[PDB]
Design an enzyme around this catalytic site. Structure first.
Site, PDB file in Angstrom:
ATOM      1  N   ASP A 164      31.787  43.384  46.584  1.00  0.00           N
ATOM      2  CA  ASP A 164      32.606  42.698  47.570  1.00  0.00           C
ATOM      3  C   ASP A 164      31.719  41.865  48.491  1.00  0.00           C
ATOM      4  O   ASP A 164      30.872  42.411  49.207  1.00  0.00           O
ATOM      5  CB  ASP A 164      33.418  43.675  48.410  1.00  0.00           C
ATOM      6  CG  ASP A 164      34.717  44.078  47.740  1.00  0.00           C
ATOM      7  OD1 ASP A 164      35.480  43.199  47.298  1.00  0.00           O
ATOM      8  OD2 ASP A 164      34.980  45.283  47.674  1.00  0.00           O
TER       9      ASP A 164
ATOM     10  N   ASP B  89      34.480  28.712  62.200  1.00  0.00           N
ATOM     11  CA  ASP B  89      34.873  27.975  61.005  1.00  0.00           C
ATOM     12  C   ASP B  89      33.670  27.195  60.494  1.00  0.00           C
ATOM     13  O   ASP B  89      33.082  26.392  61.218  1.00  0.00           O
ATOM     14  CB  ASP B  89      36.054  27.034  61.293  1.00  0.00           C
ATOM     15  CG  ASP B  89      36.651  26.425  60.023  1.00  0.00           C
ATOM     16  OD1 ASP B  89      36.273  26.822  58.897  1.00  0.00           O
ATOM     17  OD2 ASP B  89      37.508  25.524  60.147  1.00  0.00           O
TER      18      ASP B  89
ATOM     19  N   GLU C 165      43.264  41.868  45.071  1.00  0.00           N
ATOM     20  CA  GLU C 165      44.241  41.807  43.998  1.00  0.00           C
ATOM     21  C   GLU C 165      45.258  40.713  44.232  1.00  0.00           C
ATOM     22  O   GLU C 165      45.689  40.487  45.361  1.00  0.00           O
ATOM     23  CB  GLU C 165      44.949  43.160  43.886  1.00  0.00           C
ATOM     24  CG  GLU C 165      43.992  44.282  43.508  1.00  0.00           C
ATOM     25  CD  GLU C 165      44.650  45.663  43.544  1.00  0.00           C
ATOM     26  OE1 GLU C 165      45.706  45.840  44.204  1.00  0.00           O
ATOM     27  OE2 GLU C 165      44.103  46.570  42.885  1.00  0.00           O
TER      28      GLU C 165
ATOM     29  N   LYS D  66      42.085  39.673  39.711  1.00  0.00           N
ATOM     30  CA  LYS D  66      42.597  41.003  39.399  1.00  0.00           C
ATOM     31  C   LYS D  66      44.092  41.142  39.636  1.00  0.00           C
ATOM     32  O   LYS D  66      44.623  40.702  40.664  1.00  0.00           O
ATOM     33  CB  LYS D  66      41.847  42.055  40.214  1.00  0.00           C
ATOM     34  CG  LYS D  66      40.314  41.869  40.177  1.00  0.00           C
ATOM     35  CD  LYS D  66      39.524  42.945  40.955  1.00  0.00           C
ATOM     36  CE  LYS D  66      38.005  42.715  40.795  1.00  0.00           C
ATOM     37  NZ  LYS D  66      37.159  43.857  41.301  1.00  0.00           N
TER      38      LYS D  66
ATOM     39  N   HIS E 110      51.454  51.457  39.212  1.00  0.00           N
ATOM     40  CA  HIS E 110      51.843  52.336  38.118  1.00  0.00           C
ATOM     41  C   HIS E 110      52.943  53.344  38.472  1.00  0.00           C
ATOM     42  O   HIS E 110      53.447  54.034  37.588  1.00  0.00           O
ATOM     43  CB  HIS E 110      50.611  53.092  37.576  1.00  0.00           C
ATOM     44  CG  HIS E 110      49.906  53.926  38.608  1.00  0.00           C
ATOM     45  ND1 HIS E 110      50.345  55.179  38.987  1.00  0.00           N
ATOM     46  CD2 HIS E 110      48.793  53.683  39.342  1.00  0.00           C
ATOM     47  CE1 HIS E 110      49.542  55.666  39.917  1.00  0.00           C
ATOM     48  NE2 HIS E 110      48.592  54.776  40.154  1.00  0.00           N
TER      49      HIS E 110
ATOM     50  N   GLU F  42      38.686  48.323  35.026  1.00  0.00           N
ATOM     51  CA  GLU F  42      38.141  49.138  36.114  1.00  0.00           C
ATOM     52  C   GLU F  42      38.908  50.436  36.110  1.00  0.00           C
ATOM     53  O   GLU F  42      40.031  50.476  35.623  1.00  0.00           O
ATOM     54  CB  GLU F  42      38.410  48.481  37.463  1.00  0.00           C
ATOM     55  CG  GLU F  42      37.637  47.217  37.708  1.00  0.00           C
ATOM     56  CD  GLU F  42      37.927  46.613  39.062  1.00  0.00           C
ATOM     57  OE1 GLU F  42      38.721  47.179  39.832  1.00  0.00           O
ATOM     58  OE2 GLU F  42      37.347  45.562  39.353  1.00  0.00           O
TER      59      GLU F  42
ATOM     60  N   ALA G 216      40.900  53.039  38.615  1.00  0.00           N
ATOM     61  CA  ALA G 216      41.588  52.875  39.907  1.00  0.00           C
ATOM     62  C   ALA G 216      40.913  53.748  40.951  1.00  0.00           C
ATOM     63  O   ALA G 216      40.692  53.331  42.092  1.00  0.00           O
ATOM     64  CB  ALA G 216      43.071  53.256  39.800  1.00  0.00           C
TER      65      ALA G 216
ATOM     66  N   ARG H 250      32.702  54.174  41.889  1.00  0.00           N
ATOM     67  CA  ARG H 250      31.655  53.290  42.437  1.00  0.00           C
ATOM     68  C   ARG H 250      30.292  53.901  42.193  1.00  0.00           C
ATOM     69  O   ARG H 250      30.171  54.999  41.624  1.00  0.00           O
ATOM     70  CB  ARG H 250      31.759  53.211  43.956  1.00  0.00           C
ATOM     71  CG  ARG H 250      32.373  52.021  44.467  1.00  0.00           C
ATOM     72  CD  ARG H 250      32.748  52.279  45.916  1.00  0.00           C
ATOM     73  NE  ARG H 250      34.000  51.614  46.192  1.00  0.00           N
ATOM     74  CZ  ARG H 250      34.107  50.331  46.528  1.00  0.00           C
ATOM     75  NH1 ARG H 250      33.026  49.555  46.627  1.00  0.00           N
ATOM     76  NH2 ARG H 250      35.308  49.834  46.749  1.00  0.00           N
TER      77      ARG H 250
HETATM   78 CA    CA Z   1      35.984  27.412  56.717  1.00  0.00          CA
END
Ligand code: CA
Ligand code: CL
Length: 416
Positions: free
Chosen positions: A41, A52, A163, A279, A284, A359, A361, A388
């Site tokens: 991530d 910004d 996701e 993803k 489920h 992957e 879950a 992980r």
């Molecule tokens: Ca930006």
């Protein structure tokens, strides 16, 4: 069999690395076991926090350097979503805080059936979402171009928790498993986008009434379901109206995938030239509930997997799916059939020639690895990422009891 190019990767830790020596020991051990890449991530909140287009990539350059030094590949997830942020959550990594001063909260957020506002990711409906991701992808490409040889693949975040879905199930909104969650189209912006979409489709309020059997007197009386639990049993799902709502609800995600996919391709294809993926959530539970069949999937935005997966193909994005480690149950009250769900999504993707990556879950081991093995070999998966790292190797670099099974069942499928 797994695909000819299959490799096994492992997701890095959730918490920011504060002990680099420890993480390096973990990396060395994974490499020694034949792990191909580390998936990571790359938090928006970490890299554009100050303002910004004011970027700080230094932590991820360090991270990438460690991964490179251990002889591993690096698979960045451009994570334009929030981690936790509610008291007690196991992380607190919000979207860049200055975003709030750039557009209206209503246009930028999601609101559920009960009025609860969610800010796990920017709404696809905000005019500024595409632009912001385009700038971020551009910045990543510019800063990480010198790391091209170690990046074999890049992931995009299509929404909450990385996701492509709505923030339909959320503990802080009152959700607990196996709740189907709630529809997330209750901002004024979402309600107006649905009205506009129906006016554009049918041409006028009267033509909308003609299609739906309704007797509305103004466009402003058009709303998403004003009772989501009974949406199947009350004739909602089967109605022309319900199909129009669910198709539109899904179309918002599909257009978003198109927008972020095109921005990723534009920024990455001439710098990295690697496969880009996104993803689909594994929703489920409540799959076979007699009163709300597929209620969880629908609230998350999934009306038609054939069409959704077609959009992956059209956007030239690879598909990552999850729950590969889980077995079917189908018993009340969870009505959970994750193994069937994996088969469904995987079969559709293969029928369309969409490349699959997988992957687990939840953290797994033992029988979990055999289930993953079944899925990756039945469906010709091109990759599997284990969540992980600490489930495979302790902080001191020593293997857990699960590394051996992960290696025997999964890593062994890869050509070195
Ligand atoms: Ca930006
Ligand atoms: Cl955190």
């Amino acid at each position: 069999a797994v695909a000819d190019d299959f490799q096994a990767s492992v997701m890095g830790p959730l918490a920011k690395i504060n002990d680099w020596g420890s993480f390096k020991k973990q990396l060395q051990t994974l490499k020694n076991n034949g792990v191909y890449a580390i998936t990571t991530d790359v938090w928006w909140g970490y890299v554009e926090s100050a303002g910004d287009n004011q970027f700080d990539w230094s932590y991820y350059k360090t991270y990438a350097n460690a991964v490179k030094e251990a002889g591993l590949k690096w698979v960045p997830i451009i994570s334009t979503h929030k981690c936790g942020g509610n008291v007690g959550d196991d992380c607190n990594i919000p979207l860049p805080s200055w975003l709030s001063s750039k557009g209206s909260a209503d246009e930028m957020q999601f609101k559920d059936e009960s009025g609860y506002a969610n800010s796990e990711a920017l709404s696809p409906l905000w005019s500024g979402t595409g632009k912001q991701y385009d700038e971020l992808y551009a910045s990543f490409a510019e800063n990480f171009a010198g790391y091209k040889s170690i990046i074999p693949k890049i992931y995009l975040s299509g929404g909450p928790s990385g996701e492509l879905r709505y923030p339909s199930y959320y503990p802080a909104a009152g959700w607990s498993y196996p709740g189907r969650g709630k529809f997330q189209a209750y901002t004024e912006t979402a309600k107006n986008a649905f009205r506009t979409a129906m006016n554009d489709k049918y041409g006028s309020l009267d033509k909308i009434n003609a299609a739906w059997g309704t007797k509305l007197t103004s466009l402003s009386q058009i709303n998403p379901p004003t009772d989501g639990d009974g949406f199947y049993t009350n004739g909602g799902y089967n109605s022309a109206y319900g199909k129009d709502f669910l198709s539109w609800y899904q179309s918002v995600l599909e257009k978003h995938l198109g927008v972020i996919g095109a921005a990723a391709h534009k920024n990455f294809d001439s710098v990295f030239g690697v496969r880009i993926g996104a993803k689909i959530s594994g929703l489920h539970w409540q799959m076979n509930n007699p009163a709300m069949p597929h209620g969880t999937e629908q609230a998350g935005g999934y009306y038609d997997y054939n069409r959704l997966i077609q959009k992956f193909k059209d956007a030239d994005l690879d598909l990552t799916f999850t729950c590969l480690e889980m077995s079917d149950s189908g018993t009340a009250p969870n009505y959970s059939l994750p193994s069937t769900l994996v088969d469904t999504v995987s079969s559709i993707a293969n029928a369309k020639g969409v490349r699959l990556n997988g992957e687990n879950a939840l953290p797994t081991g033992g029988s979990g690895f055999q289930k993953i093995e079944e899925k990756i070999t039945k469906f010709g998966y091109h990759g599997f990422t284990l969540l992980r790292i600490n489930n495979l190797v302790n902080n001191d670099g020593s293997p857990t009891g699960e590394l051996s099974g992960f290696k025997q069942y999964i890593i062994s499928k890869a050509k070195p």
